[PDB]
């Protein structure tokens, strides 16, 4: 790692600066360096890691979708070639994230909060691989298995309003609808998740209430599209 010579605390500080500067590639590199130090990531640091790679892969996914749409309408080699270039770059980022999770974030995640967070990430980055795969079958199964393990732990160890649990269920429901050809599973998961969170809002402070209802909005938006 080219970040191996930098102190962990300096990598975290620079990741926070990169976020403020909207330099998400730098942010991701700094957070990869921090992970590779081999110590726990705190809740804040896990959020930094996730935000950084979500923004990097998000731009790649948006580009890939533009190019894939152009390639489809065209049906010279240039559109295919450039789509393949972006696709390879996207796969490389996903492989990098999955490698951090497998060596050794997940096994070293010594409580439910941290293990669920990383297993949700594992589902997400296999899902992004599935979006461009054609082999696609294996990736889909890996994403479902990671999401489901995360769900099982989260249902045992977190309340139904916990925002990590809510965002996990939201993204698993998107997986079912958009990737796995399981729209009924998507609807069932989003609806039960929404309803069980609603019935638990009375237990929350004003600030936690805001956290939970933000994700609940996204569940509602999908259910409105899907039904």
């Amino acid at each position: 790692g080219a970040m191996g010579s930098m102190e962990r605390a300096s990598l975290i500080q620079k990741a926070k600066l990169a976020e403020q500067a909207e330099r998400y590639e730098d942010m991701a590199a700094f957070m990869k360096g921090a992970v590779e130090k081999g110590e726990e990531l705190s809740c804040e640091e896990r959020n930094l890691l996730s935000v950084a790679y979500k923004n990097v892969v998000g731009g790649q996914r948006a580009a890939w979708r533009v190019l894939s749409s152009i390639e489809q309408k065209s049906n010279g080699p240039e559109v295919r070639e450039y789509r393949e270039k972006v696709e390879t770059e996207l796969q490389g980022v996903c492989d990098t994230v999955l490698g951090l999770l497998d060596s050794h974030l997940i096994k070293e995640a010594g409580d439910a909060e941290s293990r669920v967070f990383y297993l949700k990430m594992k589902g997400d980055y296999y899902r992004y691989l599935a979006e461009v795969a054609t082999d696609k079958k294996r990736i889909i199964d890996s994403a479902r298995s990671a999401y489901q393990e995360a769900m099982d732990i989260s249902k045992k160890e977190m309340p139904p309003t916990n925002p990590i649990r809510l965002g996990l269920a939201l993204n698993f429901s998107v997986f079912h609808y958009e990737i796995a050809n399981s729209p009924e599973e998507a609807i069932s998961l989003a609806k039960t998740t929404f309803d069980e969170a609603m019935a638990d809002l009375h237990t929350l402070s004003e600030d936690s209430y805001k956290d939970s209802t933000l994700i609940m909005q996204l569940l509602r938006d999908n259910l409105t599209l899907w039904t």
């Binding site: 997400d124 939201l170 993204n171 429901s173 998107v174 958009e178 996204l218 938006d221 899907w226």
Partner: peptide, 6 residues
């Protein structure tokens, strides 16, 4: 397209 965590 469906909306993921954002």
């Amino acid at each position: 397209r469906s909306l993921s965590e954002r």
